[PDB]
Write an enzyme that holds these catalytic residues in place. Structure first.
Site, mmCIF file in Angstrom:
data_model
loop_
_atom_site.group_PDB
_atom_site.id
_atom_site.type_symbol
_atom_site.label_atom_id
_atom_site.label_comp_id
_atom_site.label_asym_id
_atom_site.label_seq_id
_atom_site.Cartn_x
_atom_site.Cartn_y
_atom_site.Cartn_z
ATOM 1 N N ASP A 20 0.745 -1.274 0.128
ATOM 2 C CA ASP A 20 -0.060 0.091 0.139
ATOM 3 C C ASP A 20 0.694 1.240 -0.017
ATOM 4 O OD1 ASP A 20 -2.302 -1.558 0.049
ATOM 5 O OD2 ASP A 20 -3.001 -0.639 1.806
HETATM 6 N N1 LIG Z 1 0.702 1.901 10.780
HETATM 7 C C1 LIG Z 1 -0.494 1.975 11.189
HETATM 8 O O1 LIG Z 1 -0.797 2.906 12.317
HETATM 9 C C2 LIG Z 1 -1.743 1.563 10.327
HETATM 10 C C3 LIG Z 1 -1.798 1.308 8.976
HETATM 11 N N2 LIG Z 1 -2.745 1.018 8.232
HETATM 12 C C4 LIG Z 1 -2.688 0.731 6.908
HETATM 13 O O2 LIG Z 1 -1.510 -0.125 6.672
HETATM 14 C C5 LIG Z 1 -1.004 0.138 5.478
HETATM 15 C C6 LIG Z 1 0.425 0.045 5.505
HETATM 16 O O3 LIG Z 1 1.079 -0.624 4.492
HETATM 17 P P1 LIG Z 1 2.026 -1.891 4.433
HETATM 18 O O4 LIG Z 1 2.219 -2.244 5.750
HETATM 19 O O5 LIG Z 1 3.574 -1.064 4.006
HETATM 20 O O6 LIG Z 1 1.819 -2.711 3.342
HETATM 21 P P2 LIG Z 1 0.161 -3.402 3.501
HETATM 22 O O7 LIG Z 1 -0.677 -2.982 4.450
HETATM 23 O O8 LIG Z 1 -0.190 -3.740 2.041
HETATM 24 O O9 LIG Z 1 0.649 -5.064 4.128
HETATM 25 C C7 LIG Z 1 0.151 -6.211 3.767
HETATM 26 C C8 LIG Z 1 1.016 -6.965 2.809
HETATM 27 O O10 LIG Z 1 2.097 -7.525 3.301
HETATM 28 C C9 LIG Z 1 2.251 -8.904 2.480
HETATM 29 N N3 LIG Z 1 2.617 -9.901 3.535
HETATM 30 C C10 LIG Z 1 1.767 -10.645 4.405
HETATM 31 N N4 LIG Z 1 2.492 -11.416 4.987
HETATM 32 C C11 LIG Z 1 3.823 -11.532 4.557
HETATM 33 C C12 LIG Z 1 4.770 -12.181 4.842
HETATM 34 N N5 LIG Z 1 4.973 -13.288 5.608
HETATM 35 N N6 LIG Z 1 5.840 -12.110 4.101
HETATM 36 C C13 LIG Z 1 5.969 -11.037 3.145
HETATM 37 N N7 LIG Z 1 5.045 -10.433 2.769
HETATM 38 C C14 LIG Z 1 3.939 -10.508 3.466
HETATM 39 C C15 LIG Z 1 0.839 -9.151 2.179
HETATM 40 O O11 LIG Z 1 0.934 -9.698 0.712
HETATM 41 P P3 LIG Z 1 0.782 -11.436 0.605
HETATM 42 O O12 LIG Z 1 -0.669 -11.646 1.224
HETATM 43 O O13 LIG Z 1 0.989 -11.771 -0.707
HETATM 44 O O14 LIG Z 1 1.830 -11.784 1.520
HETATM 45 C C16 LIG Z 1 0.172 -7.459 1.828
HETATM 46 O O15 LIG Z 1 0.350 -7.135 0.313
HETATM 47 C C17 LIG Z 1 -1.870 1.314 4.759
HETATM 48 O O16 LIG Z 1 -2.770 1.261 3.955
HETATM 49 C C18 LIG Z 1 -2.322 2.051 6.039
HETATM 50 O O17 LIG Z 1 -3.356 2.563 5.852
HETATM 51 C C19 LIG Z 1 -4.045 0.772 8.848
HETATM 52 C C20 LIG Z 1 -4.177 1.253 10.351
HETATM 53 C C21 LIG Z 1 -3.073 1.543 11.175
#
Ligand SMILES: NC(=O)C1=CN([C@@H]2O[C@H](COP(=O)(O)OP(=O)(O)OC[C@H]3O[C@@H](n4cnc5c(N)ncnc54)[C@H](OP(=O)(O)O)[C@@H]3O)[C@@H](O)[C@H]2O)C=CC1
Ligand SMILES: NC(=O)C1=CN([C@@H]2O[C@H](COP(=O)(O)OP(=O)(O)OC[C@H]3O[C@@H](n4cnc5c(N)ncnc54)[C@H](O)[C@@H]3O)[C@@H](O)[C@H]2O)C=CC1
Ligand SMILES: NC(=O)C1=CN([C@@H]2O[C@H](COP(=O)(O)OP(=O)(O)OC[C@H]3O[C@@H](n4cnc5c(N)ncnc54)[C@H](O)[C@@H]3O)[C@@H](O)[C@H]2O)C=CC1
Lengths: 360, 174, 362
Positions: free
Chosen positions: B103
């Protein structure tokens, strides 16, 4: 033999010189272990947990001590003048073991001499490699170093660790540790855990390696303790530190010259140069203080700076403090117990016993 | 459509680089891949490659998420930088190592209001020469929307678990 | 164009809605920033430092607010009915921005409406991704979560980390977190880093992964009546040393997660931190503003936890306001003009131009 451990009636003291593990061992040696009805509610050790290990529960302090061949305490006993004659409760002929604070409290030692009590002062342990087992000053001051940081964190109106946030970056706290011994090293380790940027200073030169190993930075201004330097050094100790001390958020002060009162590292004039809402934790407050603004028993708000200086810091961690103190006692006792003639045969030659013993 | 790559592929790319910058995200945390991630950054530091961590302010699922885990793994604050003082430096960087993030790299944040990611600041990973993603699957991020970087660029999908594929990379680099 | 920022006159409130950095951004935006003298003392923010950033200082709240077109505040303004009419000091036709708690507190909304003041309830910031820089609920509660651990660590009789001394070893503290939202989730991190063994539980199924991402362990069964899972909660809470409660169902009172029948089956010397104390408490033995003790277990229930980190809280709170405000400063003409199609302005705007607007109560 018959060993007894009372409740601490000194106000504040939640520590005890016993634990369920230590009860098992003494029984194993050959000691009938008597404890008081609630000695260690503050230490968070129930009476039934002591009884599971194999200890009797006495009703009162007197009934505990009356038939006691050996007596383990944490604090020195109270003199008659102090309120209640605890020295008199102990059977004449018994063996006392606690932090007597001997060199200060001569009237206590007078009473023990008066009624044939063989009293053993644990603070007067020789600084030898094998003695770390029995040293109470180290065990208790390690826990005092940890909690310095928690008291610091509790009084500090910012958070310790760096956090990258949507509303912006909170910066990491800047800790400065004055004196890097048993306590000072733990404070660094503990502050580091909470994500602070820790720096430290000491008289001792080998310290630089110790601090850097924990992940802090060193600032560089004869028997296991700092020799006193004089105001030649105190003056040079000002400006080398001032760079950091200004922007520093929290200041733990550990320093202790064993003979003398505690050396003044942070003056009232230095306090003014710090940020507002900064915290100073003075651990040497009970021995004059490294900060002379610090007052025992209470927190001193002045110059826009909180100056904490609690007495009896290890008691604030009474539940960890107590079992370790009890283990220091057992380590001192164990090499002199003669099972088969189940008696306590304190060797009169063992350097442990020479530096410990006063009256007999 | 999609390009993919092994830990051997990611080794050939990053070991032969002048500047890589690391972009940790929720996947790193999920897979607890933080000690391996310093180790990969230690190998690159020893090789003579420039290394920095780019912490999007909202990466993970809480404030200070990437900080605490990078601190557990003993990354020094020196190398850690926030979005607001880093994502100009991506164009002066050969590899954009994205681990567990999806994201926070999505350029649809600065494109279309058909996404809920719209308006939010994002790390400009596309500005780097080649973009190394590491996630398990094609699945969405927190938003429930797909990154256009997947169907794009010098973007590579290093498909697998973040701890293990960072570990496999470290072995390939020696 | 003037923006005023008073001192928080409410009891037990050391926060302020400003920082030097935000002052410089507001000055740059074309405001002049008046502030009530000594309004940041509690947050370690001197008025010397504010005037350094380019800010006027006022003597009283009246002198500050009298001419202010925009007004920032942390907690809601007081009415005459409460004691001190702070709403009266606000200029007619002006803009207010604070934590109104607007939906609970109708009389503060009507008070501002009577005076033609356009108010924005910052707690009603929509949950969109762009508005995360403006969400005061997240920024403050994150710090409140961190605090719990520090407060838990204070009241607790052992240390958090395991320590292997020469004189024997002491085990680490065990921590249990009820509610894995922003607050508890930072508490898990602050606990784990201190060396404690940390567990947590939650009604949401997606939580297990979040808890696990920090090194926490999610209480869940091996294998219906699922809510015999309280036996798993019992199983851990028994040997738990510090229990931080967070769960806070919105508007409704605080769901009881630690009953007294559970408090009693618990180690003496234990601590319970109840962050939900004001909403009801997740433990109903918890008393607002005081540390109760029963069955050996301390039950801490401090009010206004973010204010315990007032010095870090305040600049974050102020930046939430600035991030909400900046978009709507045109200044090709010296004017704040609030776009209504902007959803942040839609959600937060309670009253406007002498009439109540929000569809929560009209
Ligand atoms: N930090 C905060 O205070 C908060 C953040 N958010 C939200 O979170 C987002 C932040 O983005 P970010 O955390 O960078 O990315 P993401 O939110 O997209 O994190 C999820 C991603 O991580 C991958 N993933 C899950 N498990 C693994 C693993 N075991 N190894 C490698 N990859 C993995 C998933 O892909 P896959 O399934 O293919 O593995 C998925 O695409 C923002 O949209 C924000 O709005 C919301 C509320 C609070
Ligand atoms: N039996 C043994 O082998 C023992 C050895 N030690 C050793 O002794 C060292 C210190 O022991 P502690 O009891 O902690 O010392 P301490 O309690 O007497 O003093 C604390 C620390 O403050 C420092 N200090 C004193 N005055 C100072 C000043 N004016 N300016 C800056 N620093 C000052 C000292 O270096 C000391 O380390 C430890 O590193 C430890 O290795 C400690 C206990 C037992
Ligand atoms: N703008 C944004 O994108 C924001 C998103 N969030 C997300 O929302 C989540 C929740 O944060 P908050 O709203 O602060 O939480 P909250 O204060 O509403 O509740 C705390 C937690 O307690 C749980 N809970 C409530 N009642 C319970 C019960 N009876 N038993 C067990 N658990 C119960 C909830 O599931 C929630 O996980 C976070 O994980 C975060 O990722 C949070 C703030 C802002």
């Amino acid at each position: 033999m018959k060993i007894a451990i009372p409740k601490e009636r000194r106000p504040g003291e939640d520590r005890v010189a016993i634990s369920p593990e230590v009860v098992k061992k003494l029984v194993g040696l050959g000691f009938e272990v008597i404890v008081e009805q609630g000695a260690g509610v503050g230490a968070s050790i129930t009476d039934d947990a002591l009884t599971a290990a194999g200890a009797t529960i006495a009703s009162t302090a007197a009934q505990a001590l009356s038939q006691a061949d050996v007596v383990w305490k944490v604090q020195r006993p109270m003199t008659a003048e102090e309120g209640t004659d605890e020295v008199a409760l102990i059977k004449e002929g018994a063996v006392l073991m606690c932090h007597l604070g001997a060199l200060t409290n001569r009237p206590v030692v007078e009473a023990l001499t008066k009624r044939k009590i063989t009293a053993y002062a644990m603070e007067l342990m020789p600084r030898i490699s094998r003695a770390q087992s029995m040293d109470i000053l180290a065990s208790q001051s390690n826990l005092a170093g940890y909690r310095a940081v928690i008291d610091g964190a509790y009084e500090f109106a910012r958070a310790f660790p760096m956090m990258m946030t949507a509303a912006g970056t909170v910066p990491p706290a800047r800790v400065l540790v004055f004196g890097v011994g048993v306590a000072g090293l733990q404070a660094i380790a503990t502050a580091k855990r909470l994500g602070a940027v820790v720096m430290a200073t000491d008289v001792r030169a080998a310290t630089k390696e110790q601090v850097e190993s924990l992940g802090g930075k060193f600032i560089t201004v004869a028997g296991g303790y700092a020799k006193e330097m004089g105001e030649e050094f105190r003056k040079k100790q000002a400006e080398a530190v001032l760079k950091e001390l200004v922007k520093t958020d929290i200041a733990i002060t550990t320093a202790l010259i064993p003979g003398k009162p505690a050396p003044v590292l942070i003056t009232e004039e230095m306090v003014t140069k710090m940020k507002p809402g900064s915290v100073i934790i003075d651990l040497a407050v009970e021995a004059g203080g490294n900060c002379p603004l610090s007052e025992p028993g209470k927190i001193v708000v002045k110059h826009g700076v909180k100056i904490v200086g609690h007495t009896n810091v290890p008691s604030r961690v009474a539940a960890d403090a107590s079992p370790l103190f009890a283990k220091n006692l057992l380590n001192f006792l164990t090499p002199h117990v003669d099972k088969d003639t189940k008696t306590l045969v304190m060797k009169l030659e063992d350097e442990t016993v020479s530096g410990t013993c006063v009256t007999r | 459509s999609v390009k993919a790559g092994s830990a051997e592929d990611a080794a050939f790319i990053m070991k032969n680089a002048s500047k890589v910058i690391i972009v940790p995200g929720y996947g790193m945390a999920v897979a607890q891949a933080q000690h391996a991630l310093r180790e990969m950054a230690d190998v690159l530091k020893k090789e003579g490659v420039e290394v920095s961590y780019a912490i999007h302010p909202v990466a993970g699922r809480m404030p200070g998420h990437m900080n605490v885990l990078l601190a557990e793994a003993n990354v020094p604050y020196d190398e850690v930088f926030e979005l607001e003082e880093i994502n100009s430096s991506f164009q002066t960087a050969d590899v954009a190592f994205v681990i567990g993030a999806n994201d926070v790299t999505n350029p649809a944040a600065k494109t279309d209001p058909s996404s809920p990611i719209y308006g939010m600041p994002i790390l400009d990973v596309e500005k780097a020469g080649t973009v190394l993603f590491i996630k398990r699957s094609m699945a969405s991020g927190y938003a429930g929307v797909e990154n256009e970087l997947f169907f794009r660029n010098n973007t590579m999908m290093l498909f697998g678990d973040a701890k293990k594929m960072t570990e496999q990379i470290v072995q390939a680099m020696n």
